[PDB]
Amino acid sequence: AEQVAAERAARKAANKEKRAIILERNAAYQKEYETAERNIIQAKRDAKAAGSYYVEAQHKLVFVVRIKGINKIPPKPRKVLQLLRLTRINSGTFVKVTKATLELLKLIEPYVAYGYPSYSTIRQLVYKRGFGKINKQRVPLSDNAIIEANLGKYGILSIDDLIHEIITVGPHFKQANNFLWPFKLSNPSGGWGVPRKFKHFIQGGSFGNREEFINKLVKSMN
Amino acid sequence: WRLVEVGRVVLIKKGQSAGKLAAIVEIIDQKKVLIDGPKAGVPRQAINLGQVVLTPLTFALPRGARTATVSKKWAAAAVCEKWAASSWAKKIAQRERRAALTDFERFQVMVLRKQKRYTVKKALAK
Amino acid sequence: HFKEYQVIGRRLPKLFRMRIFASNEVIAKSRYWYFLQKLHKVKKASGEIVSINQINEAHPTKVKNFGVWVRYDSRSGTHNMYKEIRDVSRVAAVETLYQDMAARHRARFRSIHILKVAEIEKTADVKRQYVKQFLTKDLKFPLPHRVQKSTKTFSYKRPSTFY
Amino acid sequence: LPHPKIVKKHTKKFKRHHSDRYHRVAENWRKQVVRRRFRGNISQPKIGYGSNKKTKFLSPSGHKTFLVANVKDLETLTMHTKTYAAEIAHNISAKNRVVILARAKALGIKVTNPKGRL
Amino acid sequence: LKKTRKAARPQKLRASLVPGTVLILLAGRFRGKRVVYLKHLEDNTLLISGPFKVNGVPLRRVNARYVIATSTKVSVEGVNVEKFNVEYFAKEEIKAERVEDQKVVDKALIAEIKKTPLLKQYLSASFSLKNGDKPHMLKF
Amino acid sequence: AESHRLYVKGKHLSYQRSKRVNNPNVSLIKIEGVATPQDAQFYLGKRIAYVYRASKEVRGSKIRVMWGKVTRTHGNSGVVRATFRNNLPAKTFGASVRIFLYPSNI
RNA sequence: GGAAUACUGCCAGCUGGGACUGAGGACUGCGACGUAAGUCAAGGAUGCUGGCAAAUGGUUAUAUGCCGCCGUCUUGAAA
RNA sequence: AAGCUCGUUCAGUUUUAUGUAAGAAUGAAGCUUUUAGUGGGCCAUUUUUGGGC
RNA sequence: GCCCUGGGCGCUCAAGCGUGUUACCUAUACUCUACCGUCAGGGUUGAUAUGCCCUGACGAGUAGGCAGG
């Protein structure tokens, strides 16, 4: 029959059109990121030159990783971790920054480490350990069609779209975070560094808010 | 008896500047001193005595001399020529060359050693 | 390896300013917040850190007899202490003071407060003999009983400690 | 050929705990420190030792052993000669063993235990 | 069997192996002998010559991973090695061609070897280790 | 030449282990002259051969040899981990070993 | 006045050394190369070569490196 | 375990209301009915009791 | 700050003490992969079946309960 070639040609044309759409979207996202970083740097330069202090915006995205085992965990932190999908050790997920969540991290802070990720780390995680949740099953993200089918209605049709939504904390942050399976992370390649892991980071420990150092820690744990 | 003093030339034992020559410009304390070596390219920085070995050579240097003054005094003193004539520098160069010898170069060295040994043995007793 | 940072705050004004020495900006912010409670009554949620910037030595190529005023919380209260240290930079001078305190008084980063650091450009101003001895004219002294790290397990020459 | 490495997982056959010390205790495995799987003690058989489906029951020669005691049983393997090998029961007399071996050779079926009582 | 997607990409030789380079064999009857590289064969072996007239090592196929490279090089442009091929070593006692071809090959290389002083005797001497040797430090 | 050696000599210390647990699947081999892991990096992937003599004449000779390989460095003293298709007997603790120069890359 | 350099972070930059893994089983799927045929590192290893009539390996004894009497009992897991 | 039927309803999870209409965040149901067993003390902790316990 | 009165060998510019900086040792912990099983989802017959399969997760445990040999 003539279907064998006709269907192949039609699907190839549709895939080519979708590829061009994704390419233009990715180019726009990259241009937006570059412009935002350049504008931030220019604003800092202007503040420094004008003899006035800078008013950096609050960190709207944080990442939390489980650092302690299940044993002897008090019930409240254990429930917090369970509701945060931080069940097994060395696992983490992105969470929106709010007082409702900051006060939650305050309780699990002794048993978790968190900070402010970056575009490079988020992209690396999504590309390597990025696993999607479909029909309650764990499906690795390897094709743009897989993500598009589950989040097409939300305007997400590629891995780059998912990364852009996650980093920008856009309107569909809830759905993007839920679709992503909790990240399975190995122990750091270079080790935790400090001789005693179970201590506050600000006093030579590990657990606690470390801001940019979380990006370095994740890459070693990736 | 080698003594630490301003203008004393030293050899760095470990670090990116290991194997290069520097001079003590100003002593900081019992264990740390300030050294420089513009000719060798080592940046002006402080170093501990444990990481540096004092050479027997010495030259006059103004206290707290800057990089330009240190370089000018080093060039004027020509301490580099004295260092090369020292047996220590000769041994260092010999070790470097010997480690850099190729297999064919080593075979030629063995042949020359046998040739020299023949004559040396013939020279004995006589 | 410490680092010098300038941290200011105003509880969202007077713009309280002080110098904080820490290995990273995160520790510097925590130390600034802790010192805020001692200086006055302020909380972290009250405002925000207006600006934090690392301060580099103007010229890390000159030996300076740093005069440092340090207050530490000993096992029986806190006492004001003053010391002079000969070094090339403030970052190294404060680290040396911290190490000396930990070696003797066993005071560490947790219970040490840095008040002021200032250079001394005139002789006879340093009242500490251990620094005063190094302020004389170009001197010379030996390094007896020097040793060498013998990588080889065995030695055949009976090494000597001469320098 | 389709005879990949067959990993036995645990070649050593399990033995009943303390059976060596006491004669009356048989070597047949039976459940009860062993129950607590203490360090340095015999391992307990469990679901971890399950053999792969694609290689279960396969002999090292890569063929299943099928017991045969009549001409019809041997002929039944004519379709499955590629996978099933013949095996003569110990109760078969030598008189029928010759016929069974001849039929197996003529139909290409390998005999796992030839030369029996011959 | 599924259509395995594994193309037979041509072998890539390390930059330390160049025609006319002096090779050292670590395995085989000629282990420790010095040999001269000539041509790379389609079978991923290295065509080498002693030469036979100098150290007795004939033309043989060898594996690169068992050969230590050396900086010493000699001219090998005048030797027509195109005649030799993988089929030249098949067997399915010395063959007559094995002598004449070896002599012809060595005739176009003995002069080059003699051009460099002490190179003939250097090749005639088998390489061997000695007490205190540190191959990792040595450049070979 | 009097010396025909073509392999770097060494010694066998003990298998990879803990305070009370030892895994014979990995053997710690010490190479003479090596001092730091950086130097030992060159010996990675080199075949390790152990030679011992037996009264009985085996199929090929009176000599029996085990064919192993190098895996990775170990410790700060330059020790390198060695793995063999058949683990060496524990009686050879402290015995010498042969480390060949192939496969090579220099 | 000028660069340089330490440090931080990025490279959908390059180039190697070493360790384990070969799991699926005629093509259907997403991609790159190409003007087209076709090729590809693209939903899981292929190509070549050498040694072999005891080959590889199994049970067992003995010696080496490390580890280590039973069921019921009070019930605080216990002697 | 045993029927229904709602796919959503729930939480040892976290702040403003004055304990909540929460179109605040995060994670991801209910009534039944009969059916085996279940009557311990203790390590640390909490409330922080007095003169050893 | 430390001393005096108040695991074995040994260690004394420690191989003792406090602290700072790198590397290394390895749990059944963690990360990648091979296999058994349970649990969950799905393809299946104009015949390919209490079967042939694809995908994911999970694997401690006395009494007790259920299932399969």
Curated annotation (Swiss-Prot), chain A:
The keyword Cytoplasm applies. It is found in: Cytoplasm. GO terms for molecular function: RNA binding; structural constituent of ribosome. GO terms for cellular component: cytoplasm; cytosol; cytosolic large ribosomal subunit. Gene3D superfamilies: Ribosomal protein L30, ferredoxin-like fold domain (3.30.1390.20). Its main location: cytoplasm. SUPFAM superfamilies: Ribosomal protein L30p/L7e. CDD domains: Ribosomal_L7_archeal_euk. The keyword Ribonucleoprotein applies. Component of the ribosome, a large ribonucleoprotein complex responsible for the synthesis of proteins in the cell. The small ribosomal subunit (SSU) binds messenger RNAs (mRNAs) and translates the encoded message by selecting cognate aminoacyl-transfer RNA (tRNA) molecules. The large subunit (LSU) contains the ribosomal catalytic site termed the peptidyl transferase center (PTC), which catalyzes the formation of peptide bonds, thereby polymerizing the amino acids delivered by tRNAs into a polypeptide chain. Present with 101000 molecules/cell in log phase SD medium. There are 2 genes for uL30 in yeast. Belongs to the universal ribosomal protein uL30 family. PANTHER family: 60S RIBOSOMAL PROTEIN L7 (PTHR11524), LARGE RIBOSOMAL SUBUNIT PROTEIN UL30 (PTHR11524:SF16). This is Large ribosomal subunit protein uL30A.
Curated annotation (Swiss-Prot), chain C:
The keyword Ribonucleoprotein applies. There is a cross-link at K116, K122, K140 (Glycyl lysine isopeptide (Lys-Gly) (interchain with G-Cter in ubiquitin)). GO terms for molecular function: structural constituent of ribosome. Its main location: cytoplasm. It comes from the Eukaryota. Transmembrane segments: none annotated. GO terms for cellular component: cytosol; cytosolic large ribosomal subunit. It is found in: Cytoplasm. Keywords: Cytoplasm, Isopeptide bond, Phosphoprotein, Ribonucleoprotein, Ribosomal protein, Ubl conjugation. The modification Phosphoserine is found at S23. GO terms for biological process: cytoplasmic translation. Belongs to the eukaryotic ribosomal protein eL20 family. Component of the ribosome, a large ribonucleoprotein complex responsible for the synthesis of proteins in the cell. The small ribosomal subunit (SSU) binds messenger RNAs (mRNAs) and translates the encoded message by selecting cognate aminoacyl-transfer RNA (tRNA) molecules. The large subunit (LSU) contains the ribosomal catalytic site termed the peptidyl transferase center (PTC), which catalyzes the formation of peptide bonds, thereby polymerizing the amino acids delivered by tRNAs into a polypeptide chain. Present with 54300 molecules/cell in log phase SD medium. There are 2 genes for eL20 in yeast. This is Large ribosomal subunit protein eL20A. It comes from Saccharomyces cerevisiae (strain ATCC 204508 / S288c). The lineage of its organism: Eukaryota, Fungi, Dikarya, Ascomycota, Saccharomycotina. The gene is RPL20A.
Swiss-Prot record, chain E:
Signal peptide: none annotated. Belongs to the eukaryotic ribosomal protein eL6 family. Keywords: Acetylation, Cytoplasm, Isopeptide bond, Phosphoprotein, Ribonucleoprotein, Ribosomal protein, Ubl conjugation. GO terms for cellular component: cytosol; cytosolic large ribosomal subunit. N-terminally acetylated by acetyltransferase NatA. Present with 37100 molecules/cell in log phase SD medium. GO terms for molecular function: RNA binding; structural constituent of ribosome. Component of the ribosome, a large ribonucleoprotein complex responsible for the synthesis of proteins in the cell. The small ribosomal subunit (SSU) binds messenger RNAs (mRNAs) and translates the encoded message by selecting cognate aminoacyl-transfer RNA (tRNA) molecules. The large subunit (LSU) contains the ribosomal catalytic site termed the peptidyl transferase center (PTC), which catalyzes the formation of peptide bonds, thereby polymerizing the amino acids delivered by tRNAs into a polypeptide chain. It comes from the Eukaryota. Component of the large ribosomal subunit (LSU). Mature yeast ribosomes consist of a small (40S) and a large (60S) subunit. The 40S small subunit contains 1 molecule of ribosomal RNA (18S rRNA) and 33 different proteins (encoded by 57 genes). The large 60S subunit contains 3 rRNA molecules (25S, 5.8S and 5S rRNA) and 46 different proteins (encoded by 81 genes).
Curated annotation (Swiss-Prot), chain F:
Pfam families: Ribosomal_L35Ae (PF01247). Component of the large ribosomal subunit (LSU). Mature yeast ribosomes consist of a small (40S) and a large (60S) subunit. The 40S small subunit contains 1 molecule of ribosomal RNA (18S rRNA) and 33 different proteins (encoded by 57 genes). The large 60S subunit contains 3 rRNA molecules (25S, 5.8S and 5S rRNA) and 46 different proteins (encoded by 81 genes). SUPFAM superfamilies: Translation proteins. The gene is RPL33A. It comes from the Eukaryota. There are 2 genes for eL33 in yeast. The modification N-acetylalanine is found at A1. It comes from Saccharomyces cerevisiae (strain ATCC 204508 / S288c) (Baker's yeast). N-terminally acetylated by acetyltransferase NatA. GO terms for cellular component: cytosol; cytosolic large ribosomal subunit. Keywords: Acetylation, Cytoplasm, Isopeptide bond, Ribonucleoprotein, Ribosomal protein, Ubl conjugation. It is found in: Cytoplasm. Belongs to the eukaryotic ribosomal protein eL33 family. Signal peptide: none annotated. One of its GO terms (molecular function) is structural constituent of ribosome. This is Large ribosomal subunit protein eL33A. GO terms for biological process: cytoplasmic translation; ribosomal large subunit assembly; ribosomal large subunit biogenesis; rRNA processing. HAMAP family: Ribosomal_eL33. There is a cross-link at K46 (Glycyl lysine isopeptide (Lys-Gly) (interchain with G-Cter in ubiquitin)). The keyword Transit peptide does not apply.
